[PDB]
Every structure is written in structure tokens, then in C-alpha cells.
Ligand binder design. Structure first.
Ligand SMILES: CN(C)[C@@H]1C(O)=C(C(N)=O)C(=O)[C@@]2(O)C(=O)C[C@@H]([C@]3(C)OC(=O)c4c(O)ccc(Cl)c43)C[C@@H]12
Ligand SMILES: CN(C)[C@@H]1C(O)=C(C(N)=O)C(=O)[C@@]2(O)C(O)=C3C(=O)c4c(O)ccc(Cl)c4[C@@](C)(O)[C@H]3C[C@@H]12
Ligand SMILES: [Mg+2]
Lengths: 207, 196
């Protein structure tokens, strides 16, 4: 194969969907590309280096609501931004676990800076703006991880005997499974956003 | 060693703190207990079975705000419940990654049912009550995961920002975020059929 950055990464992403993060090794990537290991080592030093790069690339390719639109309200930006972030994490098996074990890349700095400036120029102290942005991040991350890791454990685990399930719980699990968690996610998201709105509005009032 | 359930699990928890979740294997647990692998297999079939049990045990031992107090408001129960959940996840290395993607165990049923009933008795449709409880769960999980991970130039606002989240473990960002969630649910509940 061709062995530039882009090709190595295209191959790595496909491999990730076949094996998931734990079955992703340098040996298997060498095979898939049709090359010996020392050849690969020249381009890719080890597993950590590869993951760091996949993290960055998943967002660069698929997280396209990174910045506010012109005139857009902070509420709406938080909404769209979070939607875009879940979509991207979901696009690859173990996407979220790949992201988690990484920190922001040079390329991502000034995208995040712009996000922080945008909140402050809308009335948030730098602190409160960061808290808001983190909260949305964490909530999203956790919601996707519980979806993805729950479906990764359906392999080695039994079913729950609906027999001894109590009634509310039984109805509750049927509801989680009716979709991917999108509804619970969007509903939760609105509650977060309004909660930040109440905090901002209050200023120095007791609220 | 003794090889009952409790002993295997005590050992598994210690091992978890030494290796973290990726270095937790059946081979290494056998060694730690001073036994051959087939001996272990009789008690523990594989890694998944072990993790399912650790998940359940971490909470059974350390998650002690799992039911409402008498007279307690739903707001307050969500608050205390989430604090207690975070504390328990934090007590062991990779505690949160252990919990990921588990569902309630037979011996948790009573407890989670009671939590759902409590919300409905407080005015939530079963659906809206579940969404609230999940949102708290997911948010807490994500916040603990980013803490636990990230104990493994640069533009101005961001650099001021990162200094601020490193000033503690993330507890402040968590508790602040938590209050925003709770109030947000309050606004939704109290609106009823109003447009809000
Ligand atoms: C989901 N969005 C809110 C953000 C996002 O749009 C991006 C992005 N690259 O466009 C992030 O990287 C984010 O998704 C993201 O994951 C990071 C996150 C944040 C606040 O920025 C950080 O610099 C940073 C950090 O260094 C440590 C923890 C956290 Cl939570 C953060 C900002 C995230
Ligand atoms: C963190 N806290 C809100 C909850 C908690 O107190 C639990 C507990 N055992 O005491 C949980 O198991 C929970 O932490 C917890 O783990 C829950 C959860 O896992 C979950 C899943 O995955 C699927 C369906 C349901 Cl109904 C649940 C559910 C709602 O029971 C939650 C409850 C929470
Ligand atoms: Mg759970």
C-alpha cells in the first residue's frame, strides 16, 4: 500500500471497526497494509502514538459543529456542539474510548479558545463558561460510553431474566432500548442548558 | 488462600489498584492468590464475569446514599445520590471504567426500583424520571472518567482555564454542573403543560 499519514490512518480506522480498540495492534495493522513490521515502525512508533492520532482524526473528519454560527445564541451553540460531538464519537467502534485516553492536539487549541471566548463575550465568567463547556462534554462522553460499552459486553454476558424483573425497572429498560439513548440524551441536554441559563441570569441574586 | 467469593473479590480489588483494568488478567489474579489457573477457573470463568461482580461490589461496599431519606426532596436525593456514586467510583483505580456498560444486578433490583418509584411519586412520568436519573448517571460517569484518565506554547484563555481545572480534582466543576442539571429538571417538571 501507500504509506503516508492519511493511508495509515484510513487503514487504522477500518481495523478499529473490525477489532475494536483491544484487538487493534501494530502487528494486525502491518498485515492489513501488506507490510512487515519494521517497515511499519518507521511510520508509526507504537500503539499510543496511533491512538493519539486517531482521536484527533475522528473529530477532524466528523465533528463539524466546532464553532458558533454567526449571530448564534450560546444556548444553540451548546446544543449543536454536543450533538456533533456524540455523532462523531459514535461513528466508530470504541470511538469514545479512543478519545478518552487522549488530550487536545495543537490543531484543537485555537478551536477551543474560540469556544471559550464566545462564552465570555456572552456574559460568562471564564470559569463559569468553562464549567458549562466541560459539563456538556462530560455528559455527552458518559452517555456515549455507556451505549458503546454496553453493546461491547452483549458478547460475553447473559440476558436478564424478565421473570424476576420488578415492574418499573422492566418498563424502564424497555425504554432505554427503544433507541440508542438519543432521546434520553437530548432531553438531558436541554435540562443542562436551561440550568446554565438560570445561573447566568441570576448574577449576584440568590437563586 | 481462601477461595470463596468474598476472598476472590478482595484480591481482585487490590490487584485492580496495582495494575488498573488493562493489567487485570486471570493469570495475574491466580498468581496473587497463589494458585494455578485451572483452580481459579472453577471459581471464576473469565474476565467479564469478574468485572461484572466488581462493579456490583464497589457500589455495595461504598455507595451508601442509594435511597432517599425520610421526607427528603427529589432535588436533594439526586444531589446526595450523585455525590455518593462519585465517591465510590473514585475509590479504586479505573473504578469508572469498571462500571461502564453494566446494568443492574439481581441484588440491586429492589434499590433501583425504589429510586424510580420515588421520582414518580414526586410528579415525574416514569419516562421523565428515568431521563433525569440517567442524565445524572452519565454526567457523573464522564466527570469521574476524565479525572481518572488525566492522572495518566498555548493560547491565553485556555491556559487560564486549564490552570483552573487543575486547582482541584474536578470536584468544583462537577458540583457546579450537578446543580445546573438539577435546576434544569426542576424547570421542566414545574412547567407541566406550559410552554417553557
Ligand atoms: C464537546 N465540546 C464542548 C468540545 C469540543 O467542541 C471540542 C472540539 N475539539 O471541538 C473538544 O475537543 C472537546 O470535545 C473536548 O473534548 C475537550 C473539551 C475541553 C473543555 O476543552 C479542553 O481543552 C479540555 C481539556 O483539556 C480537558 C477536559 C475538557 Cl472537558 C476540555 C472541549 C470539547
Ligand atoms: C447513580 N445513581 C443515579 C444510581 C444508583 O444509585 C445506582 C444504585 N445501584 O444505587 C445505580 O446502579 C445507578 O448508578 C446506575 O448504575 C444505573 C444504571 O446503571 C442504569 C442502567 O444502566 C440501565 C437502567 C437503569 Cl433503570 C439504570 C439505573 C437507573 O438503575 C441507574 C441508577 C444509578
Ligand atoms: Mg450503571
Amino acid at each position: 500500500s501507500r504509506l503516508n499519514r492519511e493511508s495509515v490512518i484510513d487503514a487504522a480506522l477500518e481495523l478499529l471497526n473490525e477489532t475494536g480498540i483491544d484487538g487493534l495492534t501494530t502487528r494486525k495493522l502491518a498485515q492489513k497494509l501488506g507490510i512487515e513490521q519494521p517497515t511499519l515502525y518507521w511510520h508509526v512508533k507504537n500503539k499510543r502514538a496511533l491512538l493519539d492520532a486517531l482521536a484527533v482524526e475522528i473529530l477532524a473528519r466528523h465533528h463539524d459543529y466546532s464553532l458558533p454560527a454567526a449571530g448564534e445564541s450560546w444556548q444553540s451553540f451548546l446544543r449543536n456542539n454536543a450533538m456533533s460531538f456524540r455523532r462523531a464519537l459514535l461513528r466508530y467502534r470504541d470511538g469514545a474510548k479512543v478519545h478518552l485516553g487522549t488530550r487536545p492536539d495543537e490543531k484543537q487549541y485555537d478551536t477551543v479558545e474560540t469556544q471559550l471566548r464566545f462564552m465570555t463575550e456572552n456574559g460568562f465568567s471564564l470559569r463559569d463558561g468553562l464549567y458549562a463547556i466541560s459539563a456538556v462534554s462530560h455528559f455527552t462522553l458518559g452517555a456515549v460510553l455507556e451505549q458503546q460499552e454496553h453493546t461491547a459486553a452483549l458478547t460475553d454476558r447473559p440476558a436478564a431474566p424478565d421473570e424476576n424483573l420488578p415492574p418499573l425497572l422492566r418498563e424502564a429498560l424497555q425504554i432505554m432500548d427503544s433507541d440508542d439513548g438519543e432521546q434520553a440524551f437530548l432531553h438531558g441536554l436541554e435540562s443542562l442548558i436551561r440550568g446554565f441559563e438560570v445561573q447566568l441570569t441570576a448574577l449576584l441574586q440568590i437563586v
